[PDB]
Ligand binder design. Sequence first.
Ligand SMILES: CCCCCCCCCCCCCCCCCC(=O)OC[C@H](COP(=O)(O)OCCN)OC(=O)CCCCCCCCCCCCCCCCC
Ligand code: HEM
Lengths: 189, 403
Amino acid sequence: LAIVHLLFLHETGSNNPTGLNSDADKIPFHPYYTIKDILGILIMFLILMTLVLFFPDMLGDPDNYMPANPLNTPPHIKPEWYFLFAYAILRSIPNKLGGVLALILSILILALMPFLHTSKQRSLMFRPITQILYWILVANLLILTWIGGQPVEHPFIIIGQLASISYFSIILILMPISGIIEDKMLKLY
Amino acid sequence: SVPETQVSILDNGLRVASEQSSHATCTVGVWIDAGSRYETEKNNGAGYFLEHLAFKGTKNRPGNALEKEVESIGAHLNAYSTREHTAYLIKALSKDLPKVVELLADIVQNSSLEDSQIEKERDVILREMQENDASMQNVVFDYLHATAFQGTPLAQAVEGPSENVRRLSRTDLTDYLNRHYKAPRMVLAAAGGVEHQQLLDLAQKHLSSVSRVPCRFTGSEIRHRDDALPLAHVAIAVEGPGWANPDNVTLQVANAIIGLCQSFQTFNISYSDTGLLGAHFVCDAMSIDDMVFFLQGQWMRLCTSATESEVTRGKNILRNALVSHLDGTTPVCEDIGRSLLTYGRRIPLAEWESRIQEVDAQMLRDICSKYFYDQCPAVAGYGPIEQLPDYNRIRSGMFWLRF
Ligand SMILES: CCCCCCCCCCCCCCCCCC(=O)OC[C@H](COP(=O)(O)OCCN)OC(=O)CCCCCCCCCCCCCCCCC
Ligand code: HEM
């Protein structure tokens, strides 16, 4: 699927942070973005080996070092941290089914994302209001990651419920309206 | 059996050189060590504009009456300017040898620059430059000189920028004339049916009045992209050795080995202890990169895998060449003037043949590895040059991972 991912991209070429047509300024990849990928590989290996050789259990759970007891239940059940945002959403919706669906949508909302683009500019380099909304989205994604960790009790629950409401409202509603407003400010709309 | 070139010297320092031959017509010229390299960016078109003004009349021969004289004997009058040398030459009959020399004397001294003419020649020069851009290979070689000799007087063109052309005055010209036209930097060269003693007496009679008084290559790239042009011209060069370095001969043999793009020409341009050694090709956009790859491979083959048969072929091509040239009177005089200006002496063809026959394959690949292998080139492109590779790919093509 990653090979198919690379194919569906070379047909169009990569994007640039300005979001403009970069056909006038393109360079080879071997000497310019290869040594850059090698440097990024080296930095990622530095972070991976300082995660392995120095703090090998800062991201895992201690209770996984006990054998599986079907009779004994743990006092607090978590998935690993990268599932937390989803975990929060699931816990937030009162209905079980609702939670499952919202959870799925949490990931799927992204797929839905290319149909929500209502701006005449591709990138957010020249779009400050949608930049603010994007960083608020990153902020409450971090909040949902924290909440998942917190146990079920006040006021963690309410935050979870709001944070999920704010997440879906920023992705679904606030960004296209903001893009319309930004197009109106540049005398385009 | 080729007759020797005999050189004499006047008090002025004007070396009068001549090489007699049976042909009854002669090419008498004056070679001056003055070009765009001696200009200081405030008079960047002084030599070119003086080269335009030099045939428009003198003090003794005012205006077109002067050229009426060179029509009267049926002689031909030519002049050219490079970055280092300026030449004023006349092709005439043998029996018209005195007056021609006298004519040349006026052209170098006693010349008259008319203010009226200055405006007319400014419009000529300006317009030509305004249309000179048309000649691509000239644009590409000027771009190659500029990007290879950035910050030096060797980057600036012979014609100069339109700016200076418009902003030039008689006095400035007078200066360039009075500064770079010294007698010790001048050679009176004659080829063909001339006697050396008669030419020496004529140089003593006229022309005896002429007054007696860090080059760097930067591996770089200039890319002039204009996609509306049908063809692309690309020149790639490295630093040359200079005039006085004998391995030039060996490098010439290397060029004779090279001799995919519609047009592929190799050059060894030499200036005073510097130069540009490389290749210029003119091609369709969709071929450019492949050409470059091809070309670089040949250079590395000459650095690594030169055989005796191609060296023998290059030696034969060089011999024939130098001897094919140096045939007509002009070509010869021209060689006498450049030889006295650059080497200080006329190198005979027997010495050239000795320096050619001492070249073998081992010293050719040694000298080619000295000048081509792992060197930073200067690249100048003009036209649809998007597929022309950038500097890392060309620089990586300047060596092989297998040696
Ligand atoms: C904004 C008012 C005007 C500010 C003017 C500042 C001075 C500008 C002129 C001097 C230059 C200063 C530096 C300029 C940097 C670039 C320009 C800039 O930063 O502009 C201000 C910025 C963007 O402004 P713009 O998009 O043009 O319009 C503002 C719309 N409010 O907007 C901002 O900087 C403010 C953004 C505030 C965002 C606050 C978000 C709070 C909510 C976060 C929620 C996170 C999740 C919480 C939990 C959710 C779940 C429960
Ligand atoms: C399995 C893990 C993945 C791999 C190995 C992968 C691989 C790559 C590679 C090699 C590129 C080209 C280099 C680059 O632009 O960073 C790329 C670009 C891209 N990928 Fe992925 N990818 C992965 C996951 C994803 C996911 C989950 C998404 C969807 C959210 C995605 C969407 C994109 C997009 C949109 C680009 C274009 C970048 C741009 O032009 O801005 N990829 N990916």
